[PDB]
Design a protein around this motif. Structure first.
Motif, PDB file in Angstrom:
ATOM      1  N   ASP A  60       0.627  -0.994   0.029  1.00  0.00           N
ATOM      2  CA  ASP A  60      -0.176  -0.133  -0.163  1.00  0.00           C
ATOM      3  C   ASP A  60       1.057   0.647   0.460  1.00  0.00           C
ATOM      4  O   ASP A  60       1.586   1.176   0.533  1.00  0.00           O
ATOM      5  N   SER A  90      -3.990   2.100  -1.383  1.00  0.00           N
ATOM      6  CA  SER A  90      -4.437   0.316  -2.099  1.00  0.00           C
ATOM      7  C   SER A  90      -5.122  -0.086  -3.414  1.00  0.00           C
ATOM      8  O   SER A  90      -5.560   0.787  -3.756  1.00  0.00           O
ATOM      9  N   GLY A  91      -4.801  -1.120  -3.990  1.00  0.00           N
ATOM     10  CA  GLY A  91      -5.047  -1.563  -4.815  1.00  0.00           C
ATOM     11  C   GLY A  91      -3.745  -2.509  -6.192  1.00  0.00           C
ATOM     12  O   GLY A  91      -4.026  -2.594  -6.979  1.00  0.00           O
ATOM     13  N   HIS A  92      -2.797  -2.827  -5.212  1.00  0.00           N
ATOM     14  CA  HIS A  92      -2.010  -3.378  -5.788  1.00  0.00           C
ATOM     15  C   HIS A  92      -2.398  -4.778  -5.219  1.00  0.00           C
ATOM     16  O   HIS A  92      -2.392  -4.844  -4.174  1.00  0.00           O
ATOM     17  N   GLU A  93      -1.198  -6.109  -6.046  1.00  0.00           N
ATOM     18  CA  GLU A  93      -1.535  -6.997  -5.143  1.00  0.00           C
ATOM     19  C   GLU A  93      -0.085  -7.463  -5.426  1.00  0.00           C
ATOM     20  O   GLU A  93       0.608  -8.282  -6.177  1.00  0.00           O
ATOM     21  N   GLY A  94       0.683  -7.546  -4.716  1.00  0.00           N
ATOM     22  CA  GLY A  94       1.854  -7.517  -4.305  1.00  0.00           C
ATOM     23  C   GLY A  94       2.689  -7.006  -4.069  1.00  0.00           C
ATOM     24  O   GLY A  94       2.196  -5.342  -4.776  1.00  0.00           O
ATOM     25  N   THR A 121       5.558 -17.611  15.171  1.00  0.00           N
ATOM     26  CA  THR A 121       4.926 -17.285  14.494  1.00  0.00           C
ATOM     27  C   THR A 121       3.337 -16.707  15.463  1.00  0.00           C
ATOM     28  O   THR A 121       2.450 -15.737  15.018  1.00  0.00           O
ATOM     29  N   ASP A 128       6.604 -15.905   1.701  1.00  0.00           N
ATOM     30  CA  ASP A 128       6.204 -15.802   0.056  1.00  0.00           C
ATOM     31  C   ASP A 128       5.996 -16.027  -0.999  1.00  0.00           C
ATOM     32  O   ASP A 128       4.824 -16.433  -1.863  1.00  0.00           O
ATOM     33  N   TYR A 129       6.995 -15.018  -1.280  1.00  0.00           N
ATOM     34  CA  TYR A 129       7.056 -15.034  -2.525  1.00  0.00           C
ATOM     35  C   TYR A 129       8.095 -15.755  -3.632  1.00  0.00           C
ATOM     36  O   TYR A 129       9.227 -15.761  -4.145  1.00  0.00           O
ATOM     37  N   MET A 176       0.342 -14.523  -4.201  1.00  0.00           N
ATOM     38  CA  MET A 176      -0.342 -13.874  -3.667  1.00  0.00           C
ATOM     39  C   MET A 176      -2.058 -15.127  -2.671  1.00  0.00           C
ATOM     40  O   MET A 176      -2.240 -14.634  -1.624  1.00  0.00           O
ATOM     41  N   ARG A 189      -0.583 -17.710  -2.000  1.00  0.00           N
ATOM     42  CA  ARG A 189       0.085 -18.402  -1.088  1.00  0.00           C
ATOM     43  C   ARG A 189       0.008 -17.320   0.277  1.00  0.00           C
ATOM     44  O   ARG A 189      -0.293 -18.391   1.195  1.00  0.00           O
ATOM     45  N   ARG A 190      -0.635 -16.223  -0.295  1.00  0.00           N
ATOM     46  CA  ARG A 190      -0.481 -15.572   1.140  1.00  0.00           C
ATOM     47  C   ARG A 190      -1.361 -15.259   1.866  1.00  0.00           C
ATOM     48  O   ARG A 190      -1.765 -15.191   2.971  1.00  0.00           O
ATOM     49  N   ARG A 224      -1.795 -19.021   3.371  1.00  0.00           N
ATOM     50  CA  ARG A 224      -1.306 -18.884   4.649  1.00  0.00           C
ATOM     51  C   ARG A 224      -1.632 -18.011   6.108  1.00  0.00           C
ATOM     52  O   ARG A 224      -1.823 -18.414   7.198  1.00  0.00           O
ATOM     53  N   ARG A 242      -4.853 -19.785   7.812  1.00  0.00           N
ATOM     54  CA  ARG A 242      -4.195 -20.872   8.484  1.00  0.00           C
ATOM     55  C   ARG A 242      -3.981 -20.195   9.797  1.00  0.00           C
ATOM     56  O   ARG A 242      -4.431 -20.382  10.789  1.00  0.00           O
ATOM     57  N   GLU A 243      -3.161 -19.251   9.809  1.00  0.00           N
ATOM     58  CA  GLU A 243      -2.881 -18.230  10.701  1.00  0.00           C
ATOM     59  C   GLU A 243      -4.403 -17.936  11.773  1.00  0.00           C
ATOM     60  O   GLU A 243      -4.064 -17.674  12.723  1.00  0.00           O
ATOM     61  N   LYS A 281     -11.498  -6.661  -1.628  1.00  0.00           N
ATOM     62  CA  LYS A 281      -9.991  -6.889  -0.745  1.00  0.00           C
ATOM     63  C   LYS A 281      -8.516  -5.975  -1.147  1.00  0.00           C
ATOM     64  O   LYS A 281      -7.819  -4.934  -0.593  1.00  0.00           O
ATOM     65  N   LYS A 282      -8.789  -5.607  -2.645  1.00  0.00           N
ATOM     66  CA  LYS A 282      -7.110  -5.457  -3.510  1.00  0.00           C
ATOM     67  C   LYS A 282      -7.579  -4.042  -3.066  1.00  0.00           C
ATOM     68  O   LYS A 282      -6.614  -3.284  -3.136  1.00  0.00           O
ATOM     69  N   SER A 283      -8.524  -3.104  -3.530  1.00  0.00           N
ATOM     70  CA  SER A 283      -8.970  -1.607  -2.746  1.00  0.00           C
ATOM     71  C   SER A 283      -8.642  -1.173  -1.659  1.00  0.00           C
ATOM     72  O   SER A 283      -8.669  -0.174  -1.569  1.00  0.00           O
ATOM     73  N   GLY A 284      -9.135  -2.722  -0.537  1.00  0.00           N
ATOM     74  CA  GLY A 284      -8.809  -1.736   0.968  1.00  0.00           C
ATOM     75  C   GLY A 284     -10.193  -1.570   0.716  1.00  0.00           C
ATOM     76  O   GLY A 284     -10.262  -0.418   0.716  1.00  0.00           O
TER      77      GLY A 284
END
Lengths: 792, 175, 302, 101, 86, 256
Positions: free
Chosen positions: A432, A448-452, B81, B148-149, F1, F3-4, F7, F10-11, F98-101
């Protein structure tokens, strides 16, 4: 234009080994890891030699007549260069690990402490033409038992003192007869001996230990030979002597210990003139000027260098290089200052005109990742892995506001508004773009608006829009002002990792992970075109590899882009060993530089001869003077420049445009014609000649008659000449005349005269304003001191 | 040296100058006895630093800020964690936790390579990468975001046979 | 590789080198075997020629790389010096009316203005048997309720300075009158301070500030009047104008109180009047700098 | 079973190799021990210092048992008969001494 | 604070000479010790988790020189102070 | 992402299990707390720090009455935006949010123009509450009466007792805006009367003697019937609480 010579190296003022002065003392030669830097101390300048080496420099000596330089690496490879032309004359290979070199004060021969032997060679000639094999041995002495740890000549070139870890000080001579006179040893000594020096009358031999004892031998009587006349003792807790140097003509001993303490003594009375500590790290080498007034102390732990004047107790220089790696770079809006950032948090501000360290800032804790400026000479923003981003002034040199988020998240990339009101930082763990406002201090928004993670940010500075490039394989052009808050997403083929925008603010070059540098038009969000980069990258092989350096994709891309200030070129630098200079409208490379030939650094060799510090370029930028570009890499900030101007690049020549015809026009008093001919020829000596030749009362006529084709070039020339020209009245008359003649043309093609106006107002702000400031100050102080009533 | 017998054993019961180290070397395939010594020494530094920060007076702003700084750093490292306790810092940090934060264990955890030594061999041959750049040493404690990447390097034969078995090769990306 | 010469080998057994700017042959060599090929190394150092006999390739070096070269068309001669060496130094001063600055660095003026703060910022950093306690420190609250070393440090500083003075005891016989004041006095006798201006420009900045501060300020004010005369003559001479005005600013820094108290004495008043005459003549640089900065900012903005 | 390690800082460490333990640690006051040899019949250590003296040491007590001015300068080398009776020393002032230990 | 029931290791003359002569010195030395230990720990962790080469940070009277100066060395402190804050 | 997200979910599952175990431990320790003599996790990370943003969205091809009701809910909440889902799939919808927040989503469902269902989802893998809303009366249904004052509103919650009531009041509280003014004018009331919570908008002025309220806004009784752990894309996430209808004590059990 397309040529760039390796001009300078900033950071790492001293790296390893012997530091020397010159004969005149106006220059100090200091070793950096591959090259040799010349600090000119009278006129406040720096220079770096263009020849590289094979490994780290271990020893240096300059000839007495200021003509030759021998520089020996760690493996006998010894490059012998000329100064006044600055070319490599020869390079020999002394096979054994040479410890030290010295030139005899006659200059005919040079001694070479190598291994435990002492070698003595003759020196080749300089005015002689380049020969094939110019080296010839003169003598080899082998009377020690362990290595020669110090070497000294006599004032005459007849005797040589070799000091060795056999607790021994040996007098050899260069002649057989004087060898029979004194081929003499000197024993009876403690732990190591670190120096042996003749006195001025050469009846006394001082030896300085590692334990902390000075023994004054003197050829006295008890048919008599070399009694220990006197013993002096230093007294430190644990500090052992690491470097000694004795100027005989002013009987000065300068010692440097292992606790950073250096002491200055007068030797025969053995009085302690002074004692100062440079740090917690051992002082590694000491040199003295011939006149004894200046002393050079190099400490190779932090890479710090001091040059002292013990007469008036004045520090001529006290620089210290970066420690780890210059992680980021930022020029000034005019080009005088260049600020850098390390992996440690120490943000330094160098001056360019005198290649020195004006300031430092230690307010960060962890590695500073990016540093940028605004479109004003005031502020400099810096973002680190600390979880914060700070804002420095460069007039008061202080923080204003350490912007942060809330969860202390690590900022990688930074971007600033052109007007200086909005500061955006892009992290990696949050993807972000945080946006703070400057004057309030609290964060405006979390775009916000990216992914990664956001990989790079920048502001196109006319429309004041921002591109954000990220590992979502996307670019995202945000417009954030004026009720809209709107987004333009552009996709690419791979993970993007560097970005730059035109100085006009219409296009964006983005270097992705495949190795293509794409270039997009913003207003259409379309692709103008890309340039391939996967071929012309000279990657290195690693010594710990299991594959080849051809089929390895270790550094097959470009993690740093910057434009030209004409919008026509692109510098690209990554983790590889190359710095590529592409041209955009024709989409083809113009140049490729190899950053460093050094087998000690990892990524240098292509195929090895049958962890460690990798070489990688962190960040490249151009200069707003458009005559240079700087590369922050792991050795330092290399600066390539075109101040040589040794190139016959003409411009629309004709059969009658000769320098003789130009001087003929000067005698003809056709001054506009002579100036146009000179700018056609484009030879800077001729241009200087005619430019200073034409008189005052026709300057307005010539400035009105100069054509628009030559206007940007005469503007740039007057700027870059007026910087280092003492004819400020002439230059200001010329600038005023050109602005009076053609102002509307520059207003209509403002993008074309960008660098010209940059350099010209840099000149005026930098050297003219201080002069008229002092003039005004003296005028008002006179008015006050005479106008008012006296005291009493 | 000779598997000395009973009476000489009772005479010299302590002369042997020539097994958790080899145990973790067998079960999680660490490289070196010195590697295990490194991880255990690191946990020892954490323990000593914990005792010293407890020895500092608990109602100290400096002590609490340095403590939470260390907590957030270790959480970013991802060897633990959770965030809420300090007893997890005095006990939960293990040689097994840091050796599971190691890279080939993470590759086997993400099921890239079927076995740990196969993950090691792929890292040797240079078929993996972390974010932009690729990695060649197995002793590489991967951070949270970077694990993660993590992925294969492009145009490598292993990713080629992945996409061939899935029958989804795309040679425009020269996969 | 610089593109300034063409080397041409031709079947008259010759090798010529043409300078392209003047368009003329600067060099001519007569060889024995006709050179059928000639190339330059990409670095401008080697010239590789092959002949019609000889299985090798002759290599030649470049004194033009290691030196300057006269550019005079001497081809027929075999078979303005700034122009002929194609280098050109700048003039010292263009005209007497023109201002000039110092030939040297541009940091000298700021150093001369701020050398004292440089000193202040560059200086380095670093029991009795009969105790004498007071009624509060010991339990004597009666003396508290009816309660009734800086000079030691001053004497200590006197002792440290005395230590410095007895420490340095060099007995080398040095001259009475220093070189600077001797040259100044000679200039005042000759009514011209040209040599004084010369040594002033050539001085080291620390020496400048030490001498200017250690001028002599007595009731006749001879030295100060001579110094102001020298600076007026220098500003009329119009060279190193920045240095002359920063010298005068340094003089007003050091001896400001003395000249201010002894103001309206006719000699110092007339000297300062001549100074103001030259300075009021000089204000045109302020004029031109303001104009050029204004127009340049307006053009690059609007 | 004892491993003598004479070094440079002026120091001598008897280290038992069977139990694996530093048995004795002595500091040599004189200087960097240039030469060294063992008396094998006695199993004691002979160092040869920078003074020109040899010195006989044991892993029991932290002073030298005996000290012999052998030559001047440093002692380059020493050697001892198998019987443990005669010593031969060479010192850097072109000197050789044959001692009865 | 807490008293010590052990014998005072100094006499009356020593305690009164002490009263005749950072909050606490032992606390400051504790701060130094924990800071150097944490610096060594963060160095070890960056060695392990980093990608590029990282060196050892540092090593841990008399007139001393400070090499790095956080001001251009000819800027007076009053001149650096703003006219609002004075 | 992806995978993000895997994860992190799961947490999140592990954190909710830990919070359940520690809440049972706190119920054990409460007996000691009376012998000698707090908010949720996501709403703790963003309790009063950041102000929330909601997306109120229709179900699909909605009628004009449902669109009016969605606009009414948008006007009830502050920091709301109205969204017309047409041909948005649910994964792409929650992915775009989600992407927009976006702090939370509110999707509506009706029957022939009468709204009947409302599902709220907290977006960083937060919980989804599915309510059935019955007795809807809109401002459009009433009269042209002006407009909502839209000031940062006060909140009132009556008769929320059990742990389920605490979950619901925390969810709705953090849907609303944080840190209102003292003289904030409109107050939203959430009354609870036997599992049928009812909401009303009310403006109030303090008279010369007391208070006097005017009822405005929508008017409807909702009732919770599901609380899923994951977001509403999944339909396979664990259920934290599920309304049981065909049990014996169904017509007598409250908060179930």
């Amino acid at each position: 234009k397309s040529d760039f010579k390796f001009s300078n190296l900033l950071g790492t003022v001293y790296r390893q080994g012997n530091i020397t002065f010159s004969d005149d003392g106006k220059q100090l030669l200091s070793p950096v890891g591959n090259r040799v830097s010349v600090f000119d101390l009278i006129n406040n300048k720096s220079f770096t030699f263009e020849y590289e080496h094979r490994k780290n420099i271990a020893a240096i000596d300059l000839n007495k007549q200021g003509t030759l330089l021998i520089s020996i690496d760690e493996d006998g490879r010894a490059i012998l260069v000329n100064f006044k032309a600055r070319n490599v004359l020869h390079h020999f290979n002394f096979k054994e690990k040479c410890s030290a070199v010295k030139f005899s004060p006659d200059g005919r021969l040079f001694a070479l402490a190598s291994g435990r032997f002492l070698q003595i060679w003759k020196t080749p000639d300089v005015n002689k033409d380049r020969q094939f094999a110019p080296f010839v041995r003169h003598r080899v002495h082998a009377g020690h038992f362990q290595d020669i740890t110090s070497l000294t000549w006599s004032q005459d070139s007849r005797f040589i003192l070799t000091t060795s870890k056999d607790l021994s000080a040996k007098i050899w001579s260069v002649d057989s007869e004087e060898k029979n006179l004194a081929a003499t040893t000197f024993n009876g000594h403690r732990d190591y001996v670190m120096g042996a020096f003749f006195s001025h009358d050469q009846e006394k031999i001082y030896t300085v230990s590692k334990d902390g004892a000075v023994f004054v031998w003197e050829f006295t009587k008890r048919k008599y030979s070399w009694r220990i006349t006197k013993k002096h003792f230093f007294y430190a807790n644990q500090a052992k002597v690491k470097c000694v140097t004795f100027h005989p003509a002013t009987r000065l001993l300068a010692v440097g210990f292992t606790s950073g303490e250096f002491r200055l003594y007068d030797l025969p009375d053995f009085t302690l003139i002074q004692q100062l500590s440079m740090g917690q790290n051992p002082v590694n080498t000491v040199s003295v000027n011939q006149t004894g007034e200046w002393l050079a102390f190099g400490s190779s732990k932090l890479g710090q260098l001091l040059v002292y004047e013990w007469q008036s107790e004045s520090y001529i220089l006290k620089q210290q290089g970066h420690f780890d790696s210059t992680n980021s770079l930022a020029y000034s809006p005019d080009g005088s200052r260049v600020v850098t950032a390390s992996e440690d948090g120490k943000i330094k501000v160098w001056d360019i005109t005198s290649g020195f360290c004006l300031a430092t800032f230690e307010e960060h804790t962890s590695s500073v990742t990016a540093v940028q400026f605004a479109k004003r000479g005031q502020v400099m923003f810096s973002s680190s892995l600390d979880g914060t981003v700070r804002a420095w002034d460069l007039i008061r040199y202080r923080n204003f506001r350490t912007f942060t988020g809330t969860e202390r998240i690590q900022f990688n990339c930074l971007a600033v508004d052109p007007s200086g009101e909005v500061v955006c930082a892009g992290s990696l763990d949050n993807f972000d773009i945080h946006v703070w406002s400057v004057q309030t201090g609290q964060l405006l928004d979390a775009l916000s608006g990216h992914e990664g993670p956001v990989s790079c940010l920048s502001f196109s500075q006319e429309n004041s829009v921002l591109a954000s490039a990220s590992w979502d394989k996307t670019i995202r052009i945000w417009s954030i002002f004026g009720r809209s808050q709107q987004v333009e997403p552009i996709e690419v083929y791979s993970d993007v990792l560097a970005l730059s925008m035109r100085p006009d603010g219409k296009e964006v070059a983005v270097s992705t992970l495949k190795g293509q540098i794409s270039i997009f038009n913003i207003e259409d969000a379309k692709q103008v075109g890309n340039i391939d980069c996967r071929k012309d990258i000279i990657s290195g092989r690693f010594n710990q590899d299991r594959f080849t350096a051809k089929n390895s994709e270790r550094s097959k891309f470009f993690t740093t882009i910057h434009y030209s200030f004409d919008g026509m070129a692109i510098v690209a630098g990554g983790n590889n060993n190359s710095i590529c200079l592409y041209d955009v409208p024709n989409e083809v490379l113009l140049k490729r530089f190899i950053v460093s030939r050094n087998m000690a650094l990892n990524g240098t060799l292509e195929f090895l001869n049958s962890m460690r510090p990798e070489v990688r370029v962190t960040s490249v930028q151009f200069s707003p003077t458009a005559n240079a570009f700087a590369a922050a890499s792991t050795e330092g900030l290399l600066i390539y420049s075109t101040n040589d101007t040794i190139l016959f690049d003409p411009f629309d020549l004709d059969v009658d445009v000769t320098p003789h015809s130009t001087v003929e026009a000067l005698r003809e008093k056709q001054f506009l014609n002579a100036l146009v001919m000179a700018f056609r020829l484009n030879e800077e000596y001729l241009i200087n000649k005619v430019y200073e030749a034409i008189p005052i009362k026709e300057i307005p006529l010539v400035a009105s008659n100069i054509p628009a084709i030559y206007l940007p070039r005469i503007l740039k020339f007057i700027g870059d000449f007026a910087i280092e020209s003492q004819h400020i009245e002439f230059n200001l008359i010329w600038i005023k005349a050109l602005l009076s003649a053609s102002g509307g043309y520059i207003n209509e093609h403002k993008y074309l005269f960008s660098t010209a106006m940059r350099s010209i107002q840099r000149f005026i702000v930098r050297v003219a304003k201080e002069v008229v400031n002092t003039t005004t100050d003296n005028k008002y102080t006179y008015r006050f001191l005479v106008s008012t009533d006296g005291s009493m | 040296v000779r598997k000395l017998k009973h009476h000489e054993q009772k005479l010299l019961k302590k002369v042997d100058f020539l097994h958790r180290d080899t145990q973790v070397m067998r079960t999680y395939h660490i490289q070196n006895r010195e590697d295990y010594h490194k991880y255990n020494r690191i946990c020892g530094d954490i323990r000593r630093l914990a005792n010293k920060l407890s020895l500092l007076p608990p109602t100290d702003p400096f002590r609490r800020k340095h403590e939470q700084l260390l907590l957030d750093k270790l959480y970013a490292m991802g060897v633990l964690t959770t965030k809420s306790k300090i007893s997890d810092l005095e006990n939960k940090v293990t040689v097994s936790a840091i050796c599971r934060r190691r890279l080939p264990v993470i590759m086997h955890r993400l099921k890239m390579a079927e076995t740990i030594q196969d993950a090691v061999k792929f890292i040797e041959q240079g078929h993996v990468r972390v974010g932009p750049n690729l990695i060649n040493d197995p002793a590489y404690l991967v951070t949270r975001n970077m694990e993660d990447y993590v992925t294969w390097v492009d145009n490598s034969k292993i990713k080629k046979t992945l996409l061939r078995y899935r029958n989804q090769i795309d040679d425009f990306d020269f996969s | 590789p610089e593109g300034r010469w063409i080397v041409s080998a031709s079947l008259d057994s010759t090798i010529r080198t043409w300078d392209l700017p003047t368009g003329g042959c600067i060099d001519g060599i007569i060889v024995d075997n006709v050179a059928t090929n000639v190339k330059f190394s990409p670095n401008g150092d080697l010239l590789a020629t092959t002949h019609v006999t000889g299985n090798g390739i002759c290599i030649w070096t470049n004194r033009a790389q290691f030196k300057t070269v006269s550019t005079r068309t001497i081809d027929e001669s075999e078979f303005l010096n700034d122009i002929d060496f194609n280098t050109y130094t700048s003039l010292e001063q263009i005209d007497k009316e023109l201002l000039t600055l110092s030939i040297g660095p541009r940091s000298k003026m700021n150093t001369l203005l701020h050398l004292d703060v440089i000193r202040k910022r560059s200086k380095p950093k670093e029991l009795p048997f009969f105790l004498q306690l007071s009624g509060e420190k010991v339990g004597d609250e009666a003396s508290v309720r009816e309660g009734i070393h800086r000079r030691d440090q001053e004497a200590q500083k006197k002792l440290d300075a005395e230590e410095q003075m007895n420490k340095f005891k060099v007995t080398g016989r040095l001259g009475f009158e220093s070189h600077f004041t001797k040259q100044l006095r000679e200039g005042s006798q000759s009514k011209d301070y040209s040599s004084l201006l010369a040594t002033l420009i050539n001085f080291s900045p620390a020496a400048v500030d030490l001498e200017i501060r250690s001028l002599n300020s007595f009731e006749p004010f001879d030295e100060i009047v001579w110094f102001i005369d020298a600076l007026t003559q220098g500003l009329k001479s119009n060279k190193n104008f920045e240095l002359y005005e920063t010298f005068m600013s340094l003089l007003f820094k050091a001896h400001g109180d003395v000249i201010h108290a002894n103001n309206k004495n006719q000699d110092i008043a007339s000297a300062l009047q001549n100074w103001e005459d030259v300075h009021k003549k000089e204000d045109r640089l302020d004029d031109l700098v303001k104009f050029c900065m204004g127009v340049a900012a307006f053009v690059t903005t609007a | 079973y004892l491993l003598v390690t004479a070094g440079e800082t002026g120091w001598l460490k008897y280290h038992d190799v069977s139990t694996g333990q530093l048995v004795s640690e002595l500091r040599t006051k004189a200087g960097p021990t240039m030469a060294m040899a063992q008396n094998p019949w006695n199993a004691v250590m002979h160092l040869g210092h920078s003074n020109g003296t040899v010195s006989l040491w044991s892993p029991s007590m932290p002073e030298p048992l005996v000290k012999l001015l052998s030559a001047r300068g440093p002692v380059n080398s020493i050697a001892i008969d198998r019987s443990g009776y005669y010593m031969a020393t060479t010192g850097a002032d072109r000197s050789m001494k044959i001692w009865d230990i | 604070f807490e008293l010590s029931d052990v014998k005072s290791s100094k006499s009356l003359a020593e305690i009164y000479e002490d009263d005749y002569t950072a909050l606490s010195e032992e606390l400051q030395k504790a701060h130094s010790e924990i800071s150097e230990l944490y610096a060594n720990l963060v160095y070890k962790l960056d060695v392990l988790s980093s990608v590029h080469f990282v060196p050892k940070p540092a090593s841990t009277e008399t007139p001393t020189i400070s090499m790095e100066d956080a001001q251009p060395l000819y800027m007076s402190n009053a001149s650096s102070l703003a006219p609002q804050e004075i | 992402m992806l995978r993000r997200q895997a994860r992190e979910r799961r947490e999140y599952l592990y954190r909710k299990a830990q919070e359940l175990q520690d809440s049972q431990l706190q119920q054990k320790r409460q007996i000691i707390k009376q012998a000698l003599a707090q908010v949720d996790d996501e709403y703790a990370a963003t309790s009063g720090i950041m102000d929330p943003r909601i997306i109120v969205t229709t179900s699909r091809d909605p009628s004009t009455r449902l669109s009016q009701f969605a606009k009414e809910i948008k006007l009830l909440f502050p920091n709301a935006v109205r969204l017309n889902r047409g041909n948005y799939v649910m994964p792409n919808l929650v992915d775009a949010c989600k992407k927009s927040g976006t702090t939370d989503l509110v999707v509506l469902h009706e029957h022939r123009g009468v709204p009947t269902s409302l599902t709220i989802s907290h977006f960083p893998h937060g919980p989804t509450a599915q309510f059935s809303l019955h007795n809807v009366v809109m401002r459009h249904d009433i009269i042209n009466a002006g407009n909502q004052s839209e000031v940062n509103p006060h909140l009132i919650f009556d008769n929320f007792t059990t742990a389920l009531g605490k979950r619901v009041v925390c969810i709705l509280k953090h849907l609303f805006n944080a840190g209102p003014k003292k003289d904030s004018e409109r107050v939203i009331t959430f009354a609870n009367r036997g599992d049928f919570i009812s909401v009303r908008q009310h403006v109030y002025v303090r008279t010369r003697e007391g208070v006097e309220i005017a009822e405005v806004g929508p008017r409807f009784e909702m009732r919770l019937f599901e609380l899923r752990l994951g977001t509403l894309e999944n339909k396979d996430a664990d259920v934290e609480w599920q309304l049981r209808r065909f049990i014996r004590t169904a017509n007598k059990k409250d908060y179930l």
